[PDB]
Amino acid sequence: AANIMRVISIKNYHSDIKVIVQLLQYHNKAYLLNIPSWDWKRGDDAVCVAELKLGFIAQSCLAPGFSTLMANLFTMRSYKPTPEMSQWQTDYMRGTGMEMYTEYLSSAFNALTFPEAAELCFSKLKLLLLAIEVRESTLAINPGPKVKIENATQGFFIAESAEEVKRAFYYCKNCHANVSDVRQIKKCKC
Amino acid sequence: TFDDAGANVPLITELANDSNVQFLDQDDDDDPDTELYMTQPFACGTAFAVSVLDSLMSTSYFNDNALTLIRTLITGGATPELEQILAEGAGMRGGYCSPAVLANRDRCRVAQISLFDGPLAQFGQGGHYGELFVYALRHFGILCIGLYRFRDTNPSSKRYVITNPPEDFPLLPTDQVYVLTYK
Amino acid sequence: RKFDSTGMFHWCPDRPLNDCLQDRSQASASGLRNHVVVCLFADAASPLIGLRNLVMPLRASNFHYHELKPTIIVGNLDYLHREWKTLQNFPKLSILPGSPLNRANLRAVNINLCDMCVIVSAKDRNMEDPNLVDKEAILCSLNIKAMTFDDAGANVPLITELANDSNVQFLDQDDDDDPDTELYMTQPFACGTAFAVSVLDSLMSTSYFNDNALTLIRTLITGGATPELEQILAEGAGMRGGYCSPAVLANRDRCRVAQISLFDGPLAQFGQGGHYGELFVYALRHFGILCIGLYRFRDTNPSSKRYVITNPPEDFPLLPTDQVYVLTYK
């Protein structure tokens, strides 16, 4: 209730501020959805920790460890080995070294299907593409062969840094197509 | 214990205070200096705690679309239209549906699959994660995002989770794969 | 028809609350239009606010029964049971039990068709720092204002009681306000949307300076609660009523506060660019209608908000959109 007041006060003072609010309860959300200038299409949002918690653990009922898989993608964490770690710890921690990142696909991806774009990202760029922004416009996850990539598509990636996903922006189907030392990929002449 | 068991029951437990995770398990080999995300019960997917959600505030701000993606997966598809329909206070209005809306039943789903048998088991027999990845996407549209592997490969049923393995990462027929799928 | 024993109010023999209680289907089935909605916020144990003081004016006997505004109260049922003993004598009254925030209730109540929605709270007026105290009323106001309806929204007429005056800044948008403004200058108060108990404080001082002025305000705002009625209620028997003698029933010719439009009818000639004094002299002379102020759109050049002008000058201009506060005998 106190945090709703705030958002009321902030929006009353100026409607066009992007407001992000933490909610401890789900049932409270419906109140702030009724605020006259609350607009998620404008980027306003509510982080309902109760809704999120129960969603994360409910996915674990569908796929046992998924809450851990998914929680690690959404916090900044550096990979930092030390030699006393077992195999499974060094593996697990490499997994924790991931975050999810967002970047625009280069023009070289244009008119591929999402399947070929994912194959190309994984095989050549060493990037795990999993979703794309489709033109209103909307997110789509693992979309089927019918969906073509289009110019300036935003892609959603799992990677160790923002520095990694850049490769998807710079890739060139002439200038980089055989650059096996992937860290060498940069602004193309072609 | 049970008739024709015990620690083989799959559990997930929410914790209010993170450091209590040390009590949740035995054969643990832990140290209380470990932060939650490195602890064996969290790495096995048995623990969960609200503290791991805290960077949802910051990630919310740095890329709004990422916060929509996590919601579209973890909720199973609670779109803002549903949030509005619930905010009318009438309860969750439903019934039969038109084919035009019912088409959305082809959403992508999070699923888990085993390399022990079926067409992928050939990769579980000492192949690599990239071979599996390229094959499964190409033949089924199944997109692989990580592995779930026994901690005791040499013993317990605990398994740890490996987000996004390297292309040349080895496989066992005991491995299970986290995947995104349409069927 | 039947009245309180002093003639002053319309009246009904006693009712169990279950005669006036309705569910959403019953409320939606009822043809509620041009009615009054009371959004009541209460906990079951919270203090009795005396809603009689709300209903009783809206049942003055100098209204005819066919023009009595129907009334529906949306609120906590257990609270309303302990209020009910005071209300049960009043006709055309009903209850929908539940939260006022649950839009459904508001739609089942035809909130979009009411002549006035009242937002009122029995919650503890000191329970937190003042920024939280009115949150129930503020959220309810914004909620109703944000709705939409089939063949709307901010066109719903509202009045909201506030426990803390400075919360009025949250009550409205397109506001152009400054927090340095005192309540009486704020747009929501000047429009008649806000009200707060602080504006009653000078009733102490005015009480002392001219007792008769305090009787005048009571005779208008109560609709005619004379000290004979106060005594009859103080006997604790409940509000005794029935049929009346013509000798007491004559008091149904009281003067009433009314509001009238210059958009059409015999006065519209003055609304077409005349002056308030021309209207005043004409209306008194032909109808005994005495004019005390205007209600005018703020956005004459846009919103339905209208501001109030007490006692305009003789040469004050008029618009056909103006509405006039008047005192009348019919």
XYZ file of C-alpha atoms in Angstrom:
703
model
C 0.000 0.000 0.000
C 2.786 2.487 0.880
C 4.640 1.685 -2.365
C 1.418 2.172 -4.377
C 1.049 5.559 -2.816
C 4.484 6.425 -3.970
C 3.816 5.461 -7.526
C 0.688 7.542 -7.329
C 2.708 10.532 -6.095
C 5.424 10.069 -8.752
C 2.911 9.696 -11.629
C 0.804 12.611 -10.298
C 3.915 14.822 -10.389
C 4.783 13.688 -13.947
C 2.980 10.947 -15.899
C 5.760 10.035 -18.347
C 8.418 8.813 -15.858
C 9.234 5.104 -16.380
C 8.340 3.638 -12.951
C 9.502 0.201 -11.783
C 7.993 -0.911 -8.453
C 8.685 -3.892 -6.232
C 5.547 -5.644 -4.869
C 5.635 -8.155 -1.989
C 2.106 -9.452 -2.827
C 0.395 -10.346 -6.110
C -3.149 -9.157 -5.207
C -1.918 -5.557 -4.696
C -0.852 -5.303 -8.403
C -4.413 -4.829 -9.700
C -4.683 -1.502 -7.805
C -1.699 0.099 -9.578
C -2.897 -1.281 -12.949
C -5.865 1.126 -12.445
C -3.619 4.267 -12.065
C -4.665 6.693 -14.889
C -1.167 7.043 -16.474
C 0.329 3.615 -15.627
C 1.525 2.169 -18.956
C 3.568 -1.001 -19.443
C 3.623 -0.299 -23.211
C 5.466 2.910 -22.130
C 7.814 0.729 -19.983
C 6.237 0.967 -16.481
C 6.480 -2.349 -14.560
C 5.867 -4.215 -11.300
C 8.424 -6.773 -10.032
C 6.033 -8.940 -8.002
C 8.471 -11.109 -5.989
C 5.620 -13.432 -4.918
C 4.468 -14.042 -8.532
C 8.047 -14.545 -9.702
C 9.011 -16.878 -6.782
C 6.046 -19.172 -7.357
C 6.531 -19.141 -11.145
C 10.230 -20.103 -10.777
C 9.520 -23.007 -8.393
C 6.486 -24.130 -10.449
C 8.752 -24.523 -13.507
C 10.941 -26.788 -11.352
C 7.915 -29.120 -11.065
C 7.995 -29.373 -14.909
C 11.826 -29.662 -15.154
C 13.481 -30.406 -11.768
C 16.460 -27.956 -11.611
C 14.983 -25.206 -13.823
C 14.591 -22.590 -11.033
C 18.395 -22.694 -10.553
C 19.079 -22.667 -14.315
C 16.877 -19.644 -14.732
C 17.733 -17.698 -11.554
C 21.448 -17.731 -12.488
C 20.738 -16.128 -15.915
C 19.212 -13.016 -14.238
C 22.032 -11.931 -11.864
C 25.456 -10.526 -12.768
C 28.033 -13.143 -11.779
C 31.691 -13.468 -12.889
C 33.221 -16.936 -13.488
C 36.056 -17.257 -10.902
C 37.617 -20.772 -10.570
C 39.862 -21.976 -7.715
C 41.710 -25.347 -7.885
C 40.014 -26.980 -4.829
C 36.689 -26.996 -6.796
C 35.541 -30.462 -7.952
C 34.706 -31.120 -11.638
C 30.991 -30.587 -10.966
C 31.716 -27.293 -9.160
C 33.941 -25.976 -12.002
C 31.214 -26.992 -14.487
C 28.361 -25.547 -12.409
C 30.196 -22.276 -11.846
C 30.906 -21.951 -15.614
C 27.128 -22.205 -15.987
C 26.694 -19.439 -13.345
C 29.089 -17.294 -15.425
C 26.233 -16.809 -17.934
C 23.791 -13.948 -18.066
C 21.051 -13.272 -20.602
C 21.852 -10.421 -23.060
C 20.061 -8.600 -25.921
C 21.577 -7.437 -29.225
C 20.607 -6.576 -32.822
C 21.365 -9.206 -35.459
C 23.672 -8.092 -38.308
C 22.215 -7.855 -41.841
C 23.939 -11.217 -42.579
C 21.107 -12.930 -40.618
C 18.359 -11.361 -42.812
C 15.842 -13.833 -44.348
C 17.299 -16.882 -42.523
C 14.716 -18.857 -40.535
C 15.130 -18.645 -36.741
C 16.501 -22.261 -36.873
C 19.376 -21.274 -39.222
C 20.046 -18.122 -37.164
C 20.351 -20.234 -33.990
C 22.568 -22.798 -35.818
C 24.825 -19.964 -37.085
C 25.041 -18.267 -33.653
C 25.888 -21.493 -31.847
C 28.252 -23.041 -34.427
C 30.219 -19.969 -35.647
C 29.716 -17.181 -33.095
C 29.639 -19.388 -29.930
C 26.382 -17.661 -28.859
C 23.129 -19.284 -27.670
C 20.302 -17.375 -29.408
C 16.893 -18.373 -27.895
C 14.336 -15.657 -28.819
C 13.710 -12.644 -31.121
C 11.660 -9.428 -31.347
C 9.091 -9.875 -34.189
C 7.476 -6.846 -35.941
C 3.185 -3.383 -33.096
C 6.080 -5.760 -32.170
C 6.409 -8.766 -29.790
C 8.906 -11.245 -28.289
C 8.897 -14.851 -29.629
C 10.800 -17.811 -28.036
C 12.366 -20.544 -30.203
C 9.982 -19.651 -33.129
C 9.462 -22.289 -35.849
C 10.866 -22.360 -39.450
C 7.975 -20.167 -40.769
C 9.484 -17.084 -39.006
C 12.094 -15.288 -41.140
C 14.678 -13.013 -39.547
C 14.159 -9.384 -40.723
C 16.437 -6.313 -40.811
C 17.346 -4.879 -37.357
C 15.767 -7.859 -35.479
C 16.688 -7.747 -31.776
C 17.874 -11.205 -30.600
C 17.974 -12.646 -27.069
C 21.103 -14.563 -26.101
C 22.736 -16.523 -23.305
C 26.437 -15.549 -23.055
C 29.327 -14.792 -20.632
C 29.376 -11.007 -21.418
C 27.785 -8.244 -23.514
C 31.175 -8.341 -25.328
C 30.254 -11.809 -26.654
C 26.863 -10.904 -28.194
C 28.459 -8.130 -30.148
C 29.621 -10.811 -32.547
C 26.055 -11.162 -33.717
C 25.999 -7.471 -34.605
C 29.280 -7.470 -36.481
C 29.107 -10.791 -38.235
C 29.515 -10.544 -41.988
C 28.610 -13.367 -44.404
C 31.538 -12.370 -46.660
C 34.093 -10.695 -44.349
C 33.893 -13.069 -41.262
C 32.406 -16.364 -42.613
C 35.664 -18.380 -41.968
C 37.130 -16.445 -38.936
C 37.666 -19.518 -36.705
C 39.499 -17.393 -34.068
C 36.071 -15.952 -33.078
C 37.522 -13.207 -30.805
C 38.954 -11.576 -34.004
C 35.456 -10.650 -35.358
C 35.054 -6.821 -35.673
C 33.784 -4.113 -38.129
C 33.647 -5.757 -41.617
C 35.008 -4.281 -44.867
C 32.257 -6.189 -46.755
C 10.672 -45.344 3.980
C 8.090 -47.117 1.756
C 6.801 -50.588 0.748
C 7.420 -52.292 -2.646
C 12.148 -44.411 -1.605
C 13.146 -41.870 1.113
C 15.835 -39.406 -0.085
C 14.838 -40.256 -3.710
C 11.698 -38.031 -3.278
C 12.253 -34.935 -5.496
C 12.003 -31.778 -3.344
C 12.085 -28.041 -3.796
C 11.940 -25.883 -0.656
C 11.538 -22.137 -0.411
C 13.752 -20.561 2.306
C 13.043 -17.187 3.962
C 16.677 -16.827 5.164
C 19.413 -17.960 2.750
C 21.978 -19.179 5.320
C 19.543 -21.847 6.612
C 20.370 -23.806 3.395
C 23.307 -25.430 5.250
C 20.811 -27.474 7.367
C 18.772 -28.624 4.344
C 21.120 -31.468 3.267
C 23.856 -33.937 4.360
C 26.850 -35.511 2.476
C 27.291 -31.821 1.825
C 31.052 -30.966 2.106
C 30.004 -27.265 2.312
C 31.510 -24.231 4.072
C 29.329 -21.471 5.700
C 31.521 -18.878 3.888
C 29.804 -19.945 0.591
C 27.149 -17.609 -0.808
C 23.780 -19.238 -1.627
C 24.295 -19.549 -5.392
C 27.396 -21.776 -4.910
C 25.837 -24.080 -2.259
C 25.173 -27.720 -3.218
C 21.391 -27.589 -2.439
C 20.913 -24.527 -4.673
C 23.172 -25.933 -7.419
C 21.071 -29.142 -7.311
C 17.759 -27.191 -7.623
C 16.532 -28.347 -4.148
C 16.743 -24.917 -2.467
C 15.232 -21.625 -3.596
C 15.196 -18.221 -1.825
C 13.679 -14.789 -2.613
C 17.124 -13.079 -2.427
C 18.037 -14.465 -5.909
C 15.202 -12.285 -7.316
C 16.842 -9.011 -6.122
C 18.673 -8.286 -9.420
C 15.249 -8.404 -11.111
C 15.085 -4.702 -10.117
C 18.358 -3.834 -11.885
C 17.762 -6.138 -14.902
C 14.332 -4.672 -15.142
C 15.955 -1.337 -15.766
C 18.784 -2.369 -18.005
C 16.652 -4.317 -20.477
C 12.853 -4.315 -20.064
C 12.447 -7.019 -22.729
C 14.536 -9.458 -20.640
C 12.051 -9.069 -17.758
C 9.216 -9.836 -20.230
C 11.073 -12.965 -21.416
C 11.510 -14.366 -17.893
C 7.794 -13.678 -17.221
C 6.663 -15.377 -20.473
C 8.621 -18.526 -19.498
C 8.101 -18.777 -15.712
C 4.375 -17.840 -15.755
C 3.633 -20.190 -18.687
C 2.125 -17.158 -20.559
C 0.313 -14.720 -18.197
C -0.089 -11.842 -20.727
C -1.179 -8.318 -19.590
C -4.658 -9.052 -21.057
C -5.056 -11.745 -18.366
C -3.804 -9.319 -15.692
C -6.464 -6.828 -16.823
C -9.216 -9.502 -16.893
C -8.276 -10.494 -13.310
C -8.160 -6.783 -12.295
C -11.898 -6.535 -13.222
C -12.390 -8.623 -10.000
C -14.919 -10.988 -11.691
C -12.554 -13.983 -11.224
C -10.726 -15.678 -14.138
C -13.338 -15.623 -16.940
C -13.149 -18.700 -19.220
C -15.137 -21.235 -21.289
C -14.758 -22.709 -24.765
C -12.606 -20.615 -27.168
C -12.516 -19.568 -30.826
C -9.796 -21.241 -32.979
C -8.394 -17.712 -33.514
C -7.364 -17.387 -29.813
C -6.918 -21.163 -29.254
C -4.073 -21.084 -31.837
C -1.925 -19.726 -28.993
C -1.807 -23.203 -27.571
C 1.258 -23.730 -29.737
C 3.417 -21.714 -27.397
C 6.944 -22.824 -26.703
C 7.404 -24.819 -23.546
C 10.228 -25.601 -21.239
C 10.840 -29.306 -21.196
C 13.420 -31.821 -19.959
C 14.599 -34.889 -21.927
C 16.939 -37.853 -21.263
C 19.941 -39.105 -23.272
C 19.393 -42.639 -21.818
C 17.150 -43.814 -24.733
C 15.347 -42.458 -27.849
C 16.914 -40.825 -30.949
C 19.333 -38.531 -29.030
C 20.959 -41.351 -26.973
C 23.687 -41.697 -29.658
C 25.099 -38.340 -28.398
C 24.745 -39.417 -24.730
C 27.143 -42.279 -25.626
C 30.293 -40.075 -25.377
C 29.348 -37.334 -27.906
C 29.543 -33.553 -27.283
C 26.889 -30.955 -26.413
C 27.343 -29.097 -29.732
C 26.708 -32.278 -31.773
C 23.500 -32.839 -29.799
C 22.505 -29.148 -30.048
C 22.885 -28.931 -33.835
C 21.183 -32.299 -34.368
C 18.156 -31.731 -32.086
C 17.438 -28.256 -33.390
C 17.730 -29.428 -36.930
C 15.454 -32.413 -36.705
C 12.937 -31.369 -34.056
C 13.219 -27.559 -33.595
C 14.247 -28.475 -30.003
C 16.629 -25.814 -28.663
C 18.956 -26.950 -25.828
C 19.901 -24.523 -23.007
C 21.721 -26.729 -20.447
C 22.362 -30.095 -18.774
C 21.302 -31.802 -15.547
C 24.015 -34.280 -14.467
C 24.597 -36.588 -11.464
C 27.095 -35.199 -8.965
C 28.143 -38.774 -8.139
C 29.141 -40.254 -11.563
C 31.706 -42.660 -9.964
C 25.792 -43.104 -4.667
C 23.229 -40.255 -4.505
C 20.529 -39.149 -6.996
C 21.567 -35.505 -6.713
C 22.161 -33.777 -10.031
C 23.678 -30.397 -10.727
C 22.720 -27.951 -13.436
C 25.040 -26.738 -16.239
C 23.809 -23.634 -18.105
C 25.001 -23.404 -21.753
C 27.902 -25.936 -22.058
C 30.724 -25.331 -24.622
C 30.409 -26.949 -28.098
C 33.010 -29.659 -27.288
C 31.582 -30.391 -23.789
C 31.338 -34.216 -23.216
C 28.049 -36.109 -22.658
C 26.942 -39.161 -20.603
C 23.859 -41.382 -21.279
C 22.749 -40.397 -17.724
C 22.517 -36.683 -18.694
C 19.193 -34.871 -18.984
C 18.848 -31.758 -21.180
C 16.893 -28.557 -20.499
C 15.168 -27.661 -23.778
C 12.676 -25.319 -25.428
C 10.084 -27.177 -27.564
C 6.813 -26.944 -29.595
C 5.482 -30.518 -28.931
C -47.415 7.737 1.562
C -45.776 7.747 5.028
C -43.398 10.123 6.829
C -41.423 10.675 10.036
C -43.862 11.837 12.767
C -42.646 15.478 12.409
C -43.514 15.388 8.616
C -39.950 16.401 7.618
C -38.750 13.111 5.990
C -40.092 10.208 3.893
C -40.394 7.027 5.985
C -40.938 3.261 5.904
C -41.857 0.699 8.633
C -38.860 -1.302 9.911
C -36.907 -3.860 7.823
C -34.482 -6.718 8.518
C -31.272 -5.866 6.582
C -31.851 -8.909 4.314
C -34.784 -7.045 2.635
C -32.323 -4.343 1.434
C -29.307 -6.616 0.774
C -28.559 -7.488 -2.880
C -25.916 -9.628 -4.625
C -24.197 -8.516 -7.901
C -26.826 -10.251 -10.070
C -29.697 -8.568 -8.169
C -27.941 -5.169 -8.268
C -27.255 -5.560 -12.033
C -30.863 -6.706 -12.640
C -32.165 -3.579 -10.838
C -32.594 -0.562 -13.171
C -30.347 1.782 -11.110
C -30.102 5.144 -12.948
C -29.635 8.728 -11.654
C -29.104 7.134 -8.184
C -26.582 7.812 -5.395
C -23.792 5.295 -4.789
C -22.019 5.283 -1.419
C -18.619 3.605 -1.469
C -18.082 2.819 2.218
C -14.663 1.712 3.500
C -14.901 0.047 6.923
C -13.602 -2.759 9.116
C -16.388 -4.651 10.954
C -15.256 -3.198 14.337
C -14.489 0.401 13.107
C -16.543 3.316 14.624
C -20.094 4.125 13.420
C -19.916 7.188 11.097
C -23.702 7.839 11.303
C -24.689 7.328 7.691
C -28.098 8.429 8.677
C -26.697 11.910 8.353
C -26.054 11.098 4.701
C -29.352 9.352 3.802
C -31.725 11.657 5.732
C -31.093 14.802 3.570
C -31.603 12.694 0.490
C -35.035 11.819 1.790
C -36.433 15.220 2.619
C -40.177 15.235 2.529
C -40.374 18.265 0.171
C -39.158 15.944 -2.618
C -41.985 13.910 -4.183
C -41.520 10.136 -3.880
C -41.030 9.645 -7.656
C -38.023 12.070 -7.579
C -36.293 10.542 -4.502
C -32.839 9.377 -5.661
C -32.433 5.595 -5.138
C -29.481 4.770 -2.886
C -27.095 1.837 -2.821
C -24.294 1.373 -0.302
C -21.268 -0.736 -1.267
C -19.270 -1.811 1.800
C -18.478 -4.174 4.676
C -21.602 -6.163 5.627
C -20.783 -6.716 9.313
C -20.262 -2.965 9.740
C -23.546 -2.265 7.945
C -25.434 -4.591 10.362
C -24.454 -2.269 13.266
C -25.261 0.823 11.169
C -28.602 -0.654 9.991
C -30.683 0.122 13.112
C -30.352 3.836 12.213
C -31.004 3.410 8.436
C -33.882 0.897 8.293
C -36.710 3.499 8.291
C -35.626 5.075 4.932
C -37.258 4.034 1.579
C -35.555 3.292 -1.816
C -32.384 2.097 -0.032
C -30.211 -0.987 -0.718
C -26.860 -2.635 0.161
C -24.347 -4.547 -1.974
C -21.911 -6.223 0.473
C -18.200 -6.194 -0.520
C -15.178 -3.965 -1.226
C -15.873 -0.771 -3.235
C -12.559 -1.393 -5.072
C -13.780 -4.568 -6.804
C -14.779 -3.132 -10.070
C -17.357 -5.791 -10.596
C -19.398 -4.414 -7.755
C -19.112 -0.961 -9.386
C -20.417 -2.313 -12.676
C -23.225 -4.266 -11.047
C -24.128 -0.910 -9.376
C -24.271 0.966 -12.751
C -21.684 3.473 -11.394
C -21.582 5.101 -14.884
C -25.328 6.008 -14.601
C -25.382 7.474 -11.051
C -26.044 11.185 -10.324
C -23.341 11.133 -7.603
C -20.849 8.642 -6.214
C -19.769 9.330 -2.616
C -16.461 7.909 -1.321
C -16.396 7.737 2.498
C -14.284 5.925 5.121
C -14.824 4.694 8.689
C -11.110 3.632 8.990
C -8.977 5.110 11.818
C -8.003 8.715 10.848
C -4.592 8.595 12.725
C -3.371 5.016 11.934
C -0.156 6.124 10.058
C 1.732 9.138 8.696
C -0.834 11.218 6.722
C 0.366 10.058 3.264
C -1.046 6.536 3.932
C -4.267 7.552 5.782
C -6.388 8.371 2.684
C -4.937 5.616 0.377
C -8.234 3.657 0.378
C -10.236 6.725 -0.759
C -7.544 7.880 -3.242
C -7.252 4.414 -4.858
C -11.041 4.143 -5.049
C -11.310 7.574 -6.706
C -8.597 6.767 -9.267
C -10.085 3.293 -9.872
C -13.608 4.585 -10.703
C -12.102 7.444 -12.754
C -10.025 4.934 -14.792
C -12.929 2.567 -15.760
C -14.598 2.265 -19.221
C -18.161 1.231 -20.220
C -20.231 -0.148 -23.142
C -22.750 1.873 -25.232
C -17.927 7.077 -19.300
C -14.831 6.901 -17.013
C -13.777 10.345 -15.686
C -17.335 11.607 -16.459
C -18.586 9.761 -13.294
C -19.533 12.491 -10.752
C -17.551 11.954 -7.523
C -17.317 13.449 -4.073
C -14.640 12.067 -1.735
C -14.154 12.784 1.941
C -10.459 13.186 2.917
C -9.111 12.691 6.462
C -5.910 14.682 5.700
C -6.295 17.801 3.527
C -2.906 17.685 1.749
C -3.761 14.303 0.155
C -6.053 16.286 -2.229
C -3.054 16.756 -4.572
C -3.213 13.010 -5.489
C -6.980 13.056 -6.151
C -6.802 14.538 -9.690
C -4.641 15.073 -12.824
C -4.520 17.914 -15.451
C -4.227 19.777 -12.184
C -1.598 22.580 -12.598
C -1.541 22.841 -8.756
C 1.187 23.776 -6.254
C 1.531 22.047 -2.802
C 1.822 25.553 -1.242
C -1.950 26.026 -1.954
C -4.320 25.697 1.003
C -7.243 23.269 0.515
C -9.913 25.876 -0.262
C -7.973 27.127 -3.340
C -7.184 23.648 -4.768
C -8.860 22.638 -8.051
C -10.533 19.466 -6.611
C -12.126 21.451 -3.764
C -13.099 24.347 -6.062
C -14.755 21.770 -8.375
C -16.731 20.178 -5.471
C -14.930 16.782 -5.860
C -12.995 16.955 -2.566
C -14.321 17.581 0.934
C -12.469 17.510 4.293
C -13.512 17.963 7.956
C -11.025 20.863 8.439
C -13.389 23.249 6.543
C -15.897 22.749 9.411
C -13.496 24.205 12.046
C -14.853 27.794 11.846
C -18.272 26.332 12.726
C -17.061 26.742 16.343
C -16.327 30.468 15.929
C -19.376 31.194 13.708
C -21.439 29.319 16.199
C -20.458 31.908 18.746
C -20.635 35.018 16.652
C -24.142 34.406 15.318
C -26.130 31.410 16.611
C -28.848 31.931 13.979
C -26.297 31.393 11.171
C -25.502 27.933 12.601
C -29.266 27.182 12.610
C -29.514 28.290 8.955
C -26.700 25.989 7.790
C -28.335 23.104 9.720
C -31.807 23.775 8.224
C -30.309 23.612 4.699
C -27.706 20.814 4.954
C -29.869 18.443 7.061
C -32.949 18.994 4.851
C -34.890 20.003 8.044
C -33.795 17.986 11.133
C -35.600 20.152 13.759
C -34.868 19.751 17.526
C -38.234 17.922 17.865
C -36.763 15.134 15.689
C -33.564 15.132 17.781
C -35.704 14.682 20.907
C -37.820 11.913 19.297
C -34.593 10.067 18.354
C -33.195 10.668 21.890
C -36.155 8.621 23.280
C -34.239 5.626 21.750
C -37.440 4.116 20.222
C -36.068 4.608 16.664
C -37.476 7.208 14.221
C -41.244 7.075 14.903
C -43.353 7.672 11.755
C -46.543 6.734 9.857
C -49.238 8.704 8.054
C -49.504 12.392 9.110
C -52.153 15.046 9.757
C -52.423 17.826 7.105
C -51.480 20.260 9.914
C -47.916 18.813 10.190
C -47.754 17.620 6.538
C -48.029 21.298 5.456
C -44.307 21.507 6.260
C -43.626 19.637 3.074
C -43.530 23.028 1.382
C -40.100 23.761 2.760
C -37.573 25.534 0.609
C -35.117 23.295 -1.154
C -31.713 23.664 -2.630
C -31.839 22.933 -6.311
C -29.669 23.251 -9.424
C -30.930 24.372 -12.862
C -29.416 24.736 -16.367
C -29.341 27.759 -18.705
C -29.049 25.370 -21.723
C -32.857 25.194 -22.331
C -36.190 26.241 -20.722
C -37.423 29.796 -19.965
C -34.124 31.064 -18.447
C -31.935 30.090 -21.463
C -32.423 33.617 -22.916
C -30.097 34.892 -20.121
C -27.604 32.032 -20.708
C -27.257 33.434 -24.267
C -24.830 36.236 -23.216
C -26.984 37.966 -20.538
C -25.834 38.889 -16.998
C -26.393 37.238 -13.605
C -28.440 40.195 -12.286
C -30.878 40.017 -15.237
C -31.368 36.305 -14.539
C -31.637 36.883 -10.762
C -34.330 39.569 -11.000
C -36.267 37.630 -13.649
C -36.244 34.208 -11.923
C -37.197 35.571 -8.528
C -39.953 37.611 -10.023
C -41.591 34.908 -12.058
C -40.903 31.772 -10.022
C -39.822 32.867 -6.495
C -36.524 31.102 -7.396
C -33.648 32.815 -5.569
C -30.181 32.388 -7.169
C -27.055 32.073 -4.961
C -24.268 31.120 -7.422
C -23.057 29.506 -10.658
C -21.429 26.215 -11.642
C -19.293 26.739 -14.778
C -16.928 24.587 -16.889
C -13.257 25.271 -16.198
C -12.491 24.411 -19.837
C -14.770 26.794 -21.845
C -12.310 26.912 -24.821
C -11.834 19.227 -22.839
C -12.854 18.157 -19.300
C -16.282 18.092 -17.576
C -14.904 19.793 -14.470
C -16.884 22.810 -13.320
C -16.018 25.381 -10.702
C -18.363 27.123 -8.314
C -18.967 30.908 -8.175
C -20.725 32.134 -5.007
C -22.815 35.324 -5.491
C -21.654 36.824 -8.856
C -21.852 40.637 -9.435
C -24.991 42.060 -11.143
C -23.168 42.597 -14.483
C -21.409 39.176 -14.405
C -21.664 37.462 -17.873
C -23.500 34.158 -18.518
C -23.007 31.143 -20.848
C -25.731 28.650 -21.973
C -23.488 25.951 -20.383
C -23.849 27.533 -16.896
C -25.837 25.873 -14.118
C -27.312 27.946 -11.261
C -27.508 27.102 -7.550
C -30.989 28.164 -6.413
C -33.452 28.112 -3.525
C -36.964 26.988 -4.594
C -40.504 25.957 -3.463
C -41.311 23.479 -6.328
